[PDB]
Amino acid sequence: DLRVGRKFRIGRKIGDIYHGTNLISGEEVAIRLESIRSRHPQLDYESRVYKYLSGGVGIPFIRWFGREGEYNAMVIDLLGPSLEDLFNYCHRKFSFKTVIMLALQMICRVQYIHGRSFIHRDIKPDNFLMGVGRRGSTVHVIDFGLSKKYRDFNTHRHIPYRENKSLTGTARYASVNTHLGIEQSRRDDLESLGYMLIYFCKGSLPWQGLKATTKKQKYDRILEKKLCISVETLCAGLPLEFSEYMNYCRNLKFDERPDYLYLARLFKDLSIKLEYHNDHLFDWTMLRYTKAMVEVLMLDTSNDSFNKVKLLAMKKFASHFHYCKNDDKHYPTPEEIKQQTVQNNNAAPPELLSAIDK
């Protein structure tokens, strides 16, 4: 039949991950499957790391794992869409408030994972998922297949410094040290997270879309950009905190303990200056709500519908929606940024505008 770990039942694909259901309590879960004849198995390891990290905020709870039939199975918390998904939903650009709120959580998660002697080594928007329903306010971390100890569990002795390492894993968010074949450590997780943030803020990274004849060549093309672009150019249009974060991560030593509190204070102090409340009201939350209230379709016609729904949201919630301007060459001050609140309330179809107010 289709039962896993005594009390669980496989449903439709998601998806080798399937919808699962606890047969005793009726709770929805997720179930990952892996053929026991795989050339390279990942699932058991990922399951054991999940177990080792169990109990950490934002770390999915593994309900069961073991061998079932001719498969390895993993039963775990059912989660929502990825940050990449929500990035796309918001048409590939996040507000400052959203990026700040995300950076704050993601710095906490990474700090926890590091506290359990592990480095993720595949930090990227796809590996952070919000929860389902009411837990949709919490950022979760997944895909620990490439994860790895960075120190002894008992002696906290850091792994030794190595070179000539192939790139793991995704090149867009890989640190500069990873490109140079250096052994990864804690700094590299944080550095990728920095690239995530700039990516979110500005809508892309300047080393996207590159083509090459070979795999190493593309890697080296990306590296050349990561290495030859100034942090000023890279964080143009961003408050100084983003440049500070990146400068900080690039100056960390191989075995150095990151000051996570300092990094968190960067964005927290910034939020206060930009008058943002940590109310877990994300961009997509407000956009979704505004579209819900609109559905004035005949006037929405006179991506165009989204742009207008985005306008109605930026009008309703003027104080929340500040964006980075890519034409900017400088870092904006909090006051320069907040001027967008006034211009947001200045967004001019009167029936649309009235339906907003209603």
Of 195, 59, 78, the closest CA to residue 116 belongs to 59
Of 123, 113, 115, 145, the closest CA to residue 45 belongs to 145
What interhelical angle do 304-316 and 283-294 show, nearest 10? 110
Neighbouring CB atoms inside 10 A of 210's CB total: 15
Question: H/E element holding 10?
Answer: strand 8-13
Sequence-ordered alpha helix ranges (H) in the chain: 43-53, 83-89, 96-115, 176-179, 186-202, 215-228, 231-234, 240-251, 260-273, 283-294, 297-300, 304-316, 334-344, 350-357
Q: What's the rounded Cα separation, in Å, for the pair 336 and 76?
A: 45
Residue labelled with tokens 């039942």: 9
Q: What's the rounded Cα separation, in Å, for the pair 103 and 346?
A: 29
- Residues with Cβ within 8 Å of 325's Cβ and at least 6 positions away in sequence, in order, are 237, 332
User: Is 72 in contact with 33 (CB distance < 8 Å)?
Assistant: yes
User: Is 21 in contact with 90 (CB distance < 8 Å)?
Assistant: no
Q: What's the rounded Cα separation, in Å, for the pair 182 and 209?
A: 25
Residue labelled with tokens 């709500």: 289
What interhelical angle do 186-202 and 240-251 show, nearest 10? 160
User: Is 50 in contact with 144 (CB distance < 8 Å)?
Assistant: yes
The CA-based dihedral angle spanning residues 256, 261, 267, 268, taken in that order and rounded to the nearest 10 degrees = 180
Q: What's the rounded Cα separation, in Å, for the pair 299 and 200?
A: 31
Q: What's the rounded Cα separation, in Å, for the pair 240 and 156?
A: 34
User: Is 245 in contact with 263 (CB distance < 8 Å)?
Assistant: yes
Q: What's the rounded Cα separation, in Å, for the pair 272 and 16?
A: 43
Report domain extents, the chain.
1-358
User: Is 316 in contact with 356 (CB distance < 8 Å)?
Assistant: yes
User: Is 216 in contact with 224 (CB distance < 8 Å)?
Assistant: no
Of 329, 320, 290, 336, the closest CA to residue 95 belongs to 320
The CA-based dihedral angle spanning residues 312, 277, 193, 158, taken in that order and rounded to the nearest 10 degrees = -170
Q: What is the DSSP letter of 288?
A: H
What interhelical angle do 240-251 and 260-273 show, nearest 10? 170
Choose, from 1, 85, 122, 283, the residue flagged as catalytic: 122
User: Is 148 in contact with 199 (CB distance < 8 Å)?
Assistant: no
Q: Is the dihedral of CA 134, 48, 142, 10 positive or negative?
A: negative
269 is catalytic: no
Experimental method for this entry?
A: X-ray
What interhelical angle do 304-316 and 350-357 show, nearest 10? 50
Taking CA atoms, 260 is separated from 102, 148, 173, 228, 355, in Å, by 15, 20, 19, 27, 44
Task: Decide the pairing of beta strands 139-141 and 28-35.
Answer: unpaired
Task: Decide the pairing of beta strands 139-141 and 71-77.
Answer: unpaired
> Two tokens at 321?
């929606």
> Two tokens at 252?
């960390």
User: Is 183 in contact with 165 (CB distance < 8 Å)?
Assistant: yes
Span between the terminal Cα atoms of the chain, in Å: 53
For residue 29, list its beta bridge partners. Answer: 20, 77
> Two tokens at 93?
């650009």
Q: What's the rounded Cα separation, in Å, for the pair 344 and 322?
A: 9
Q: What's the rounded Cα separation, in Å, for the pair 343 and 322?
A: 10
Q: What's the rounded Cα separation, in Å, for the pair 242 and 273?
A: 15
Specify whether the backbone of 117 is left (phi greater than 0), alpha (psi in -120 to 50) or beta.
left
Q: Determine phi and psi for 298, rounding to 5 degrees.
A: -65, -35
User: Is 276 in contact with 97 (CB distance < 8 Å)?
Assistant: yes
Task: Decide the pairing of beta strands 71-77 and 28-35.
Answer: antiparallel
Secondary structure (DSSP) of 73-116: EEEEE-EEEEHHHHHHHTTS---HHHHHHHHHHHHHHHHHHHHT
> Two tokens at 163?
């070179």
Which amino acid, 100? Answer: I
User: Judging by beta carbons within 10 Å of its beta carbon (0-12, 13-18, 19+), is residue 240 exposed, middle or buried?
Assistant: middle
